[PDB]
């Protein structure tokens, strides 16, 4: 299972093409990739390097709340969005009227209030827009065979207002044999930094909706568009490529939860996670 990610790293270091990007450092890029990660009695948290599990859990809770405020996530101890919500970074894109911390209409706003007119991060959008997340959960409950269970974060109208366009832009759910599966289309994948984070994120989301809809987790299909390795990540990934993968851990929910909003960080417990030491990989801004 984890051999698919490491096999994607091998294929990009060997067959990747040089390609400049938005940031400064170039990449080795490959277009069009797909890997399948089983969720049956295991959770896909990479073992060749310690993955920031506390950030995955808190960011998803921050996603489910519908918040677009990096400070509310930073208050929990997760600074991954502080960079993209700084006065320096915000002023660069022409959002000088915008208060610090407002990422604009991003994943949390599109998941719960798709189509509503975005005011600011402190507004109240309850009853406005399309609540895709709850609509997904309802369809799985009443019509699991439906082929239209999609949560889309790519809004061409709200694109000029986002600090960073959605990278995991579209996901689709699927039910058969009382197993819930999820396929994610990621338009842009930082194979060293974001991709392991995104894999655990949507795997955790599948466990949540499976717990709500009374199903067993099945497969997570990760579909990549531009899969790229930043130049300053080549050396750290070559080290991680030498480490022997260890068996995946397991995720256990500790209390029966009925609504998706009532999930708390204390409800989850990762058991048997024995990863290799963390490898530093700098973020390209």
Ligand X SMILES: Nc1nc2[nH]cc(Cc3ccc(C(=O)Nc4cc(Cl)ccc4C(=O)O)cc3)c2c(=O)[nH]1
Ligand Y SMILES: O=c1ccn([C@H]2C[C@H](O)[C@@H](COP(=O)(O)O)O2)c(=O)[nH]1
Provide, for the chain, the percentages of residues in helix, strand and coil under a 3-state DSSP scheme, each rounded to the nearest 5: 35, 25, 45
Q: Given candidates 168, 211, 222, 233, which one binds ligand Y under the rule CB under 6 A?
A: 168
Place of tokens 């049956």: 40
| Residue 79 touching ligand X (CB under 6 A) | yes
Q: Given candidates 2, 102, 190, 226, which one binds ligand X under the rule CB under 6 A?
A: 190
**For residue 183, what are its two tokens?**
């396929």
Distance of CA 106 to the CA centre of its chain: 12
Residue 220: strand, helix, or coil: strand
Side-chain half-sphere CA neighbours of 57 within 13 A:
19
| Residue 221 touching its own copies (CB under 8 A) | yes
- Rounded distance between C-alpha atoms, residue 253 and residue 233, angstroms: 34
Tell me the closest approach of the beta carbon of residue 178 to ligand X, in angstroms: 26
**For residue 234, what are its two tokens?**
């080549």
Pairing of strands 179-190, 216-230: parallel
Kindly identify the residues of this chain, within the stretch 229-268, that bind ligand X according to CB under 6 A.
none
Site track 194-233 with ligand Y (rule: CB under 6 A), x = hit: xx--x-----------------------------------
| Residue 167 touching ligand Y (CB under 6 A) | yes
Q: Is 167 a catalytic residue?
A: yes
Q: Which residue number has the CB closest to ligand X?
A: 194
Q: Which residues contact ligand X by CB under 6 A?
A: 52, 55, 79-80, 190, 193-194, 197, 278, 283-284
Enumerate binding residues for ligand Y (CB under 6 A): 22, 147-148, 164-165, 167-168, 188-190, 194-195, 198
């Amino acid at each position: 299972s984890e051999l698919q990610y490491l096999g994607q790293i091998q294929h990009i270091l060997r067959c990747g093409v040089r390609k400049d990007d938005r940031t400064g450092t170039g990449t080795l890029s490959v277009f069009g990739m797909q890997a399948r990660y089983s969720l049956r009695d295991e959770f896909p948290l990479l073992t060749t390097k310690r993955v920031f599990w506390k950030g995955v859990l808190e960011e998803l809770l921050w996603f489910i709340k519908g918040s677009t405020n990096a400070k509310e996530l930073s208050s929990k101890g997760v600074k991954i969005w502080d960079a993209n919500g700084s006065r320096d970074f915000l002023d660069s894109l022409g959002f000088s009227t915008r208060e610090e911390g407002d990422l604009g209409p991003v994943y949390g706003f599109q998941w719960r209030h798709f189509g509503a007119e975005y005011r600011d991060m402190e507004s109240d959008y309850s009853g406005q827009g399309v609540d895709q997340l709850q609509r997904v959960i309802d369809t799985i409950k009443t019509n699991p065979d439906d082929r239209r269970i999609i949560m889309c974060a790519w809004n061409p109208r709200d694109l000029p207002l986002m600090a960073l366009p959605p990278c995991h832009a579209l996901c689709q759910f699927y039910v058969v044999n009382s197993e819930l599966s999820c396929q994610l289309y990621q338009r842009s994948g930082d194979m060293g930094l974001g991709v392991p984070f995104n894999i655990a994120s949507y795997a955790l989301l599948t466990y949540m909706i499976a717990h709500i809809t009374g199903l067993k987790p099945g497969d997570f299909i990760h579909t990549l568009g531009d899969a790229h390795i930043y130049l300053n990540h080549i050396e750290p990934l070559k080290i991680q490529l030498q480490r022997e993968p260890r068996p995946f851990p397991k995720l256990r929910i500790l209390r029966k939860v009925e609504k998706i909003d009532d999930f708390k960080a204390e409800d989850f417990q990762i058991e048997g996670y024995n990863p290799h030491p963390t490898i530093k990989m700098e973020m390209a801004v």
